[PDB]
Amino acid sequence: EAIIRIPPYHYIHVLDQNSNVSRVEVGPKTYIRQDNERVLFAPVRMVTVPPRHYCIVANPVSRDTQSSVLFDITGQVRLRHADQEIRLAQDPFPLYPGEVLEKDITPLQVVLPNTALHLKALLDFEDKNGDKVMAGDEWLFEGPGTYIPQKEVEVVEIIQATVIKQNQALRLRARKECFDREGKGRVTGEEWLVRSVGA
Amino acid sequence: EAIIRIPPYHYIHVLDQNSNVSRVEVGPKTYIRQDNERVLFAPVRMVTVPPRHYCIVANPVSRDTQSSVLFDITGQVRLRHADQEIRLAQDPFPLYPGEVLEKDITPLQVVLPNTALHLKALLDFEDKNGDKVMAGDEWLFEGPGTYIPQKEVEVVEIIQATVIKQNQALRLRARKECFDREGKGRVTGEEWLVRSVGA
Amino acid sequence: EAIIRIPPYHYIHVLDQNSNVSRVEVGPKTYIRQDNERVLFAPVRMV
């Protein structure tokens, strides 16, 4: 059917069968298609993101200074084929051609007061404070709070703080050459003891 | 049938099959539909809220300064796709398009004099007094009274105050680093004793 | 069919089934009709 039935917060993709340009048409409009706006898929929901949630979209659209979705000379959208994008709470964002939802809608990542996250960088990048990060650095997201799940970082594990009662101690074994809480250099495998009470 | 039979406190949804605009038509009126006001569902009751009750409506309508239901340029209602809304006692409110009743009609939440509610914030928000709240803070709704059930907070559990008779005491174990009633810093797992008589 | 195929020097009549208004639509345009622009007759020559 040449008439297409797009609800107010839905969109579809149309291919220009004369110039290969795929472009997303969003409602609200009762749209008409010739065979230069050939429909690809259905007006299906195109679900949005609830507040304090996040999504990973693969091959995102390049955005200008004003965060404007860029297009090519032919009119095709400007993608980031070698990147992803983390979408936080926002409008029912349009899925431009090539933009495939890498990881679907999901709740956020909140950490308990007495736990931590093993945040390991997968690829080289610079943090918001901007000092330096290797390709494979590991740091510890601390206690009560919430992390912003990024594409350059990965949560290796959740680490529950071990309760140390009085008249007890913890035997720590370093996996790599490093320092400790007090400032004593620890070589790999050198087991030491911490007597601090608490968690 | 082109004639539609809307009782005084009922409403339905009509789609404009020319511009995709879905809009709610409320009685009282014997309404007439062309194929630009195509009916979606029945004039079924559209139940209201009794006093001192609450409902959760998903994807609520955006409201202006005068709490006016906003519409888009095309005429479609302005929703909050990434939010909910708590509706207290009021008129048989109209369910605008997209507005789906997340949680149906229910009684309120009243607390016994010797019990409390474990109110944990699920998402970051600011309370009415407006000081600060984390994404995962926990506080205790106190005894005799009634809480206003919000979307940003969750009742983890109901906690009945434990009766402490004279010549008796309670062994309290802190789950996290914190303070106590008297002002003594308690580390995780450090069991202490409270000898106050009462509940 | 909701899509109507009007040659450059042809025209048809459309009735607004909501207000009875009949009005002539002339090409050239590949016109679209809802049931407020109901076509009456063909795009025939109109000599």
Swiss-Prot record, chain C:
MVP repeats lie at residues 1-47. Phosphorylated on Tyr residues after EGF stimulation. It is found in: Cytoplasm; Nucleus. Signal peptide: none annotated. The vault ribonucleoprotein particle is a huge (400 A x 670 A) cage structure of 12.9 MDa. It consists of a dimer of half-vaults, with each half-vault comprising 39 identical major vault protein (MVP) chains, PARP4 and one or more vault RNAs (vRNAs). Interacts with TEP1. Interacts with PTEN and activated MAPK1. The phosphorylated protein interacts with the SH2 domains of PTPN11 and SRC. Interacts with APEX1. May interact with ZNF540. Required for normal vault structure. Vaults are multi-subunit structures that may act as scaffolds for proteins involved in signal transduction. Vaults may also play a role in nucleo-cytoplasmic transport. Down-regulates IFNG-mediated STAT1 signaling and subsequent activation of JAK. Down-regulates SRC activity and signaling through MAP kinases. MVP 3 mediates interaction with PTEN. This is Major vault protein. The gene is Mvp. The chain holds residues 5 to 51 of 861 of the full protein.
